[PDB]
Every structure is written in C-alpha cells, then in structure tokens.
Amino acid sequence: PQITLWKRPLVTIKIGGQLKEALLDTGADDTVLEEMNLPGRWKPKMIGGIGGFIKVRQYDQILIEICGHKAIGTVLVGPTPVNIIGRNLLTQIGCTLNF
Amino acid sequence: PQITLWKRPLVTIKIGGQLKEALLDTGADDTVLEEMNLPGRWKPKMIGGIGGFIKVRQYDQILIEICGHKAIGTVLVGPTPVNIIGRNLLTQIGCTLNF
Numbered sequence: 567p568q569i570t571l572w573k574r575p576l577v578t579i580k581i582g583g584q585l586k587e588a589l590l591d592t593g594a595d596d597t598v599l600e601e602m603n604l605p606g607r608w609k610p611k612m613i614g615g616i617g618g619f620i621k622v623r624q625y626d627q628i629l630i631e632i633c634g635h636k637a638i639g640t641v642l643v644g645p646t647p648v649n650i651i652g653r654n655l656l657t658q659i660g661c662t663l664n665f
Numbered sequence: 666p667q668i669t670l671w672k673r674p675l676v677t678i679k680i681g682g683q684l685k686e687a688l689l690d691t692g693a694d695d696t697v698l699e700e701m702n703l704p705g706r707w708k709p710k711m712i713g714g715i716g717g718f719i720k721v722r723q724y725d726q727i728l729i730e731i732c733g734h735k736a737i738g739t740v741l742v743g744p745t746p747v748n749i750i751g752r753n754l755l756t757q758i759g760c761t762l763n764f
C-alpha cells in the first residue's frame with residue numbers, strides 16, 4: 567500500500583505471538599519495541615535520541631509480521647514510549663520513501 | 666525520487682540560505698535541527714523523544730527546501746542528536762511510504 571504522512575504511520579505488527587501498533591520509522595536504524603518479556607538470550611545496548619539515551623535489550627533473528635509482510639531481524643526491547651519499526655525491517659518488506 | 670532504506674535517508678536541505686544534511690524521519694511529527702542561527706522571531710518550546718524532553722526554539726513559517734522541494738513550516742532548533750525532517754514538512758513535499 568501507500569501510506570501518507572498526515573498522521574503517524576502506525577501499522578499492526580505481530581511479534582512473539584502478540585499484535586501491537588508500531589511506527590514505520592525511516593529515522594530509526596533498528597527496531598525498538600516497548601517492554602515485553604521475550605524468551606531467549608539478549609545483549610545490552612544503549613540508543614540515543616531526543617532527550618538522551620535509553621537502555622534496551624537486543625534480541626536477534628526475531629520474526630515480525632508487518633501488515634502481512636514477514637521479516638526477521640534484530641529487535642531492541644526497552645522503555646520506549648512507542649513501538650518503532652526501523653530500517654533493518656522496513657527494507658525486508660520492500661518499504662520506500664517516495665516524493 | 667524513490668528512496669530505499671538500506672542506508673539512512675539523508676538529504677541536503679537549504680534553510681536560512683545555508684546547505685545542511687538532514688534525515689528524513691517518518692517517526693518524527695516535527696522537524697528538529699541542531700543548533701543554528703535563524704532569522705526571525707522564535708518562541709521557547711519543549712519536545713520529547715525516545716530519551717525524554719529537550720528545550721527548543723520554535724521558528725514558524727520558515728522556508729526550507731528539501732532535496733529540491735520547497736516547504737514553509739515550523740522548524741524547531743535545539744540539541745537533537747541529528748537534523749531530522751519530520752512529517753510537518755514531509756507532507757508538504759509530497760512524501761509517502763510505499764511497500
């Protein structure tokens with residue numbers, strides 16, 4: 567589909583057997599999801615934005631479905647105020663910017 | 666153009682007669698640029714991101730050309746980690762997400 571930007575580009579995602587709303591975010595290198603208790607090993611990471619850094623848990627090879635499009639890659643889990651689909655997964659669903 | 670997302674969507678902007686690099690950021694409501702001198706009146710404002718809130722100067726109705734496309738809108742100046750172009754201007758240049 568084509569998503570205009572009059573409002574936040576929120577879409578439904580499926581991750582860890584749960585459905586969530588998340589931003590398709592070209593400004594994020596990686597995908598950052600609100601606190602959730604995923605199984606498996608993880609590595610500590612810190613990511614910086616407006617306001618400073620937050621601590622997140624980096625999980626690798628996680629399957630995410632975005633609007634019925636399947637992807638697999640890294641997801642960072644931490645106290646983000648919003649679920650963020652980053653470029654690491656946006657490329658896997660064929661997402662481009664167009665103007 | 667059509668912009669793929671294997672690399673950061675960085676583009677050249679012109680604002681206040683000066684060229685700069687900026688990130689096209691669909692996860693940003695607003696456009697926030699790093700500290701710079703801009704002519705005209707401004708008002709102190711706050712904006713929040715993934716790490717908390719910062720103080721910015723709000724410049725309204727500013728002329729800004731993004732990758733050859735003109736916009737006139739609000740520009741917030743403050744300690745953002747990166748120059749970002751947000752939806753308030755992305756809509757003006759006709760930018761959409763497509764997949």
Ligand SMILES: CCC(CC)CN(C[C@@H](O)[C@H](Cc1ccccc1)NC(=O)O[C@H]1CO[C@H]2OCC[C@H]21)S(=O)(=O)c1ccc([C@@H](O)CO)cc1
Nearest residue numbers: 593594595596613614615616692693694695713714715747
């Ligand atoms: C380019 C640097 C920053 C942005 C300065 C990139 N961020 C994405 C950005 O889309 C962010 C998303 C967002 C966060 C909180 C609330 C709502 C949206 N939007 C944002 O701050 O918008 C501001 C401006 O407009 C307002 O609307 C929304 C808030 C206001 S991030 O989340 O901090 C981040 C940092 C590092 C990584 C790692 O992967 C390495 O990249 C991934 C993601």
